[PDB]
Every structure is written in structure tokens, then in C-alpha cells.
């Protein structure tokens, strides 16, 4: 490890294991049907996904 | 008691004798120990041990199981003269994986834990089905002669034998891998059965003593001849040769002249008794340079396992025929069976191989059970069946209890 600016891991220490957010960035579905118009199978599928 | 001498295995196979501290905890020794094995390999001119990515160094038994890092060498069952192995074990830490929608999740996981059917197995199943098929055909053909001992049985069976054998011949010459050889071996194994009854079915008149001699004769010759040129499946072929040869002698005697079955049965029992004593000697005579030892050792083991098994079959068939609940001194053969069972039960402990020791042990139990069943079905009575049931259930229970308690 180096302190010279470009090394982003300096001063960082591992404490254990757990949850973290992936590097993916999700875009919202265009033309989403209203709550009364949603089909049941595809509704929970896209929600739990 | 302060130290113990043991052999330590290192990379690619060098064994080194070392005198270790008997009470320090093993984790204290693995670091300097790695240095020492590396130093000796360097002087010997070999390549040292090295790590790969993420992992750790451990000291393990020859079976690979690691020793508890905090316990003392005396605390573990390690004695002077034993050996250990120094080893690199990689890091198992990795991300967890989740699929939520259940239909896909079932398919994904279920496809990794089990094996799907494939064309290689399909062919072996086919071979197994045809073998089962022909043994059924010979059975019905062989049953008809008891009512009508005409030429039909031999004529019909002979062509089947030739056809099955002709196919096995082409398969044996074309086989390239053990998968192919198993298919061919199953095909060949099945060819012996039709030819045997085909030959035995040739001599006319009511079936009996004269017809039997040909069957056991050709059976003995065919089993031996197949082994000679094939050199595989030693156990099954050898067992057939023994029962075939011994039965042929008994059949010949009965055909020529025999005062009683008890005489032949007693003679066979005596022949098997001497054979049980000679068994390891027969196996020994019948069986880059290092390879010669490995081949000979398992070949001997193969011949011996079949030999002990075949003799077992003969004595159980003979003993169950010798004892009888109505003939003469009913108790005499019953106690003789007991003495015979005791010899096999005691002698079975002298064998180290699991299947040889287990097969011998089981042979004694079945003899006892079969005689009890014989004395229960015949000379039937409520007390008799009641008594045998009590004996038959307690007999094995006592044997298990002696080992479990």
C-alpha cells in the first residue's frame, strides 16, 4: 500500500463479512402500468427481482 | 518421553526422518519445519515448496486430515515411528449466490447435484437386458425337456449360443476402452449358459445321471477357456470352474456306481475341507519393475475370493442335504453341522480382506439358519416352529450383541 493519492485503499482495514451494494445501476421500466392494471405473475416477478 | 521420531512427507514425495518435541503445540513447529524441508531439498538439488495465491500451511496425517493446531503432539495419538505430511491448503472464501424465482432456482440447483442419462450408460443397460433375456429363454427350453426330452431343446439352444458368441467375438476385437469391455464381458458371460444346457440336452431318454455329466463338463471347460484368453472377470469364472469340476466328479461317480448320496455328499464335504486349508497356496501358485508386484498381489486376491466363495456354495448345498429330521440318528448330522460351523467361524478371523473375511463369516450363519429352517418345515409342529423361531432370531442377535456391547 501507498499513500500517494491514486491508491484508494490506504487507511482502510477489513473488519469482517457482510452485505454490500453491487456495481450495477438499474434503470426504471418505461410506461409502467398503474397498480390496478398490473398483471399478477409479472408483477411479483419484477418486484422480487 | 520428551521427544518422538517420525517421518515427514514433503513436496512431490521426499520422506525425511525427524525427531519432534512431544509436548509443544503443533502450530509452533510447522513454520521452522517448512524451512528445514526446503533447505534439504535445496541441497539435494530439488525444487522447494511454494504457496499459490491465498491459503495456509498445515501438518496432516498421511490420510490428509489436519491435526488440531492448538493441541500437543502427545495429546494426539501420534507415536514414535509414525509419519505425517506437511501440506498447502487453499482459501475457500467466496461470494454467496442467490436465485429467488423458484422454477428457475429448482432447475439450476437440481442439475448440479445429480447426473443425467447419457449414451454410454444406455448401451450398458441394453447389454444387461439381453443377458437377462437369454437366461430366461434357456430356462423355458430347459424346462420343456423334463416332459419331452427330444432334439428340439438342443437344436434350438445351439443356434442361440452360436449367435450370442459370434456377436461377443466382434465386440471383443473392436473394444478400445473399459466401457466397451464391460459391454463385451456381459455379452460373453451370457453365452456360457445356453451352450451348457444345449450339450447336456443331447443324450436321449429320461434326464438324469448320464445327461448331467456333459453339462458340468462343457461348463467347466468353457469357463476356464474364457478366462485363459480374456484374462478379466477372474472371480466369476473361477467360481464356476470350481462348482463345475467338483459336480462333474460326483455326477460321474453316481452314473457309474454309488451306494448312497450320503457317501458322495460326505466325500464332497471332505474334499472342500482340504481345499479350504489349501486355498491360499492355490491362489499363490495360480497367480518400471515395481509394477510386477502390484499386478500379482490383486490377481492372487481375485482367485482366493472366488475360491473361498465357491467352496462355501458346495458345503451349504452338501450340509443341507446331509442333515435330516427323520433319517436314523437325527442328532448326529445336526452336531456335525455345529462342529463344521465352528471351524469356519473360527478360521474366518485369519483373513484380513473384508470381503474374504465377511463372506466366510456369512457362510457359517447361512448354514446354521438353513438347517434350522429344514428342521422346522419338515417334522412340523407348533412347538417345533416356536422353538426354531426363538433360536433363529436369537442366534444372529447374540452375534451382533457380542460385537456391539
Contacts of B100 in chain A (CB under 8 A): 48-49
Contacts of B101 in chain A (CB under 8 A): 45, 48-49
How deeply is B302 buried, as exposed, middle or buried, from its count of CB atoms within 10 A (0-12, 13-18, 19+)?
A: middle
C-alpha grid cell, residue B204: 436321449
C-alpha grid cell, residue B72: 500437543
Query: Could you tell me which chain B residue has the CA closest to the CA of A42?
Result: B101
Query: Could you tell me which chain B residue has the CA closest to the CA of A20?
Result: B95
- Residues 93-122, chain B, touching A (beta carbon < 8 A): 100-101
Report d(CA B18, CA B46) in Å as an integer.
Answer: 19
Q: Within 13 A of B68's CA, how many CA atoms are on the CB side?
A: 9
How deeply is B299 buried, as exposed, middle or buried, from its count of CB atoms within 10 A (0-12, 13-18, 19+)?
A: middle
Contacts of A49 in chain B (CB under 8 A): 100-101
C-alpha grid cell, residue B108: 439450476
B285 touches chain A (CB under 8 A): no
Residue B274's DSSP bridge partners are none
Contacts of A45 in chain B (CB under 8 A): 101
Quick one: CA torsion of B301, B305, B306, B311, rounded to 10 degrees? Answer: 130
Quick one: CA torsion of B101, B107, B109, B112, rounded to 10 degrees? Answer: -160
Residues after which chain B is broken (C–N above 2.5 A) are 287
* Cβ-Cβ contacts under 8 Å for B373 (sequence gap 6 or more): B388, B392
Resolution of the coordinates, Å? 3.8
Report d(CA B2, CA B76) in Å as an integer.
Answer: 15
- The stretches of B291-381 forming alpha helices (DSSP H) are 291-322, 331-347, 354-377
Phi-psi region of B20 (alpha: psi -120 to 50; beta: other; left: phi over 0): beta
C-alpha grid cell, residue B326: 427323520
Rg (CA), chain A: 20
CB B217 within 8 A of CB B240: no
Query: Could you tell me which chain A residue has the CA closest to the CA of B98?
Result: A49
Q: Which residues of A have a CB under 8 Å from any CB of B?
A: 45, 48-49
Distance, in angstroms, between B116 CA and closest chain A CA?
Answer: 29
Contacts of A48 in chain B (CB under 8 A): 100-101
* Cβ-Cβ contacts under 8 Å for B163 (sequence gap 6 or more): none
CA B386 remoteness from chain centre: 36
Report d(CA B150, CA B205) in Å as an integer.
Answer: 8
Report d(CA B115, CA B118) in Å as an integer.
Answer: 9
Distance, in angstroms, between A36 CA and closest chain B CA?
Answer: 23
Query: Could you tell me which chain B residue has the CA closest to the CA of A22?
Result: B95
What does residue B379 show for φ and ψ, rounded to 5 degrees?
Answer: 60, 45
* Cβ-Cβ contacts under 8 Å for B234 (sequence gap 6 or more): B227, B299, B302, B303, B306
Report d(CA B78, CA B80) in Å as an integer.
Answer: 7
Please report the number of interchain residue pairs, chain A to chain B, with beta-carbon separation below 8 angstroms. Answer: 5
Method by which the model was determined: cryo-EM
Contacts of A18 in chain B (CB under 8 A): none
Distance, in angstroms, between B92 CA and closest chain A CA?
Answer: 14
Residue of B101, B102, B103, B105 to mutate for A, most A C-beta atoms under 10 A? B101
CB B343 within 8 A of CB B368: no
Distance, in angstroms, between B52 CA and closest chain A CA?
Answer: 21
Which residue reads 464391460 in cell numbers? B182
Distance, in angstroms, between A6 CA and closest chain B CA?
Answer: 25
Report d(CA B312, CA B243) in Å as an integer.
Answer: 10
Question: H-helix or E-strand containing B395?
Answer: helix B382-404
Amino acid at each position: 500500500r501507498k499513500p500517494d493519492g491514486k491508491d484508494l485503499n490506504f487507511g482502510v482495514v477489513r473488519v469482517g463479512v457482510g452485505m454490500t451494494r453491487p456495481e450495477v445501476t438499474w434503470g426504471e421500466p418505461q410506461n409502467m402500468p398503474t397498480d390496478i392494471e398490473l398483471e399478477p405473475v409479472t408483477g411479483k416477478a419484477l418486484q422480487e427481482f | 518421553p520428551q521427544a518422538v521420531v517420525v517421518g515427514v512427507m514433503a513436496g512431490e514425495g521426499v520422506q525425511i526422518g525427524v525427531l519432534l518435541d512431544a509436548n509443544a503445540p503443533v502450530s509452533v513447529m510447522t513454520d521452522p519445519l517448512l524451512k528445514v524441508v526446503n533447505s534439504r531439498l535445496r541441497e539435494l538439488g530439488e525444487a522447494p515448496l511454494e504457496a499459490t495465491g491465498r491459503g495456509r500451511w498445515a501438518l496432516c496425517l498421511v490420510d490428509g486430515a489436519p491435526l488440531r493446531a492448538t493441541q500437543s503432539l502427545t495429546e494426539q495419538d501420534v507415536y514414535d515411528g509414525d509419519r505425517l505430511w506437511i501440506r498447502f491448503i487453499a482459501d475457500t472464501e467466496r461470494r454467496s449466490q442467490v436465485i429467488e424465482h423458484i422454477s428457475t432456482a429448482v432447475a439450476s440447483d437440481l442439475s448440479k447435484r445429480f447426473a443425467r442419462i447419457d449414451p454410454i450408460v444406455a448401451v450398458q443397460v441394453g447389454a444387461s437386458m439381453v443377458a437377462t433375456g437369454v437366461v430366461l429363454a434357456t430356462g423355458v427350453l430347459g424346462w420343456w425337456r423334463w416332459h419331452h426330452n427330444t432334439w428340439l431343446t438342443t437344436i434350438y439352444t445351439a443356434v442361440i449360443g452360436v449367435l450370442v458368441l459370434a456377436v461377443a467375438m466382434l465386440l471383443l476385437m473392436r473394444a478400445k476402452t473399459d466401457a466397451d469391455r464391460r459391454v463385451a464381458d456381459i455379452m460373453l458371460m451370457s453365452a456360457i449358459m445356453p451352450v451348457t444346457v444345449a450339450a447336456a440336452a443331447a443324450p436321449p431318454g429320461p434326464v438324469g445321471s448320464p445327461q448331467a455329466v456333459l453339462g458340468f463338463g462343457v461348463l467347466t471347460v468353457a469357463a476356464a477357456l474364457a478366462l485363459r484368453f480374456t484374462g478379466r472377470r477372474l472371480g466369476i469364472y473361477t467360481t464356476i470352474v470350481i462348482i463345475g469340476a467338483l459336480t462333474m466328479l460326483a455326477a460321474l461317480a453316481r452314473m457309474v456306481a454309488a451306494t448312497s448320496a450320503v457317501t458322495l455328499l460326505s466325500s464332497l464335504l471332505l474334499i472342500c475341507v482340504v481345499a479350504y486349508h489349501a486355498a491360499p497356496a492355490l491362489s499363490r501358485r495360480l497367480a518400471s519393475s515395481v509394477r510386477d508386484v502390484l499386478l500379482q498381489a490383486e490377481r492372487a486376491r481375485s482367485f482366493l475370493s472366488g475360491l473361498l466363495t465357491g467352496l462355501g456354495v458346495m458345503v451349504v448345498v452338501c450340509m443341507t442335504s446331509l442333515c435330516d429330521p427323520h433319517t436314523g440318528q437325527r442328532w448326529l448330522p445336526l452336531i456335525l453341522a455345529g462342529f463344521t460351523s465352528g471351524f469356519l467361524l473360527l478360521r474366518g478371523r485369519s483373513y484380513v480382506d473384508r470381503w474374504q473375511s465377511i463372506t466366510l463369516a456369512g457362510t457359517a450363519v447361512i448354514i446354521a439358519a438353513a438347517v434350522c429352517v429344514r428342521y422346522a418345515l419338515e417334522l412340523s409342529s407348533p412347538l417345533a416352529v416356536s422353538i426354531v423361531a426363538a433360536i433363529l432370531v436369537l442366534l444372529p442377535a447374540a452375534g451382533m450383541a457380542a460385537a456391539a456391547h
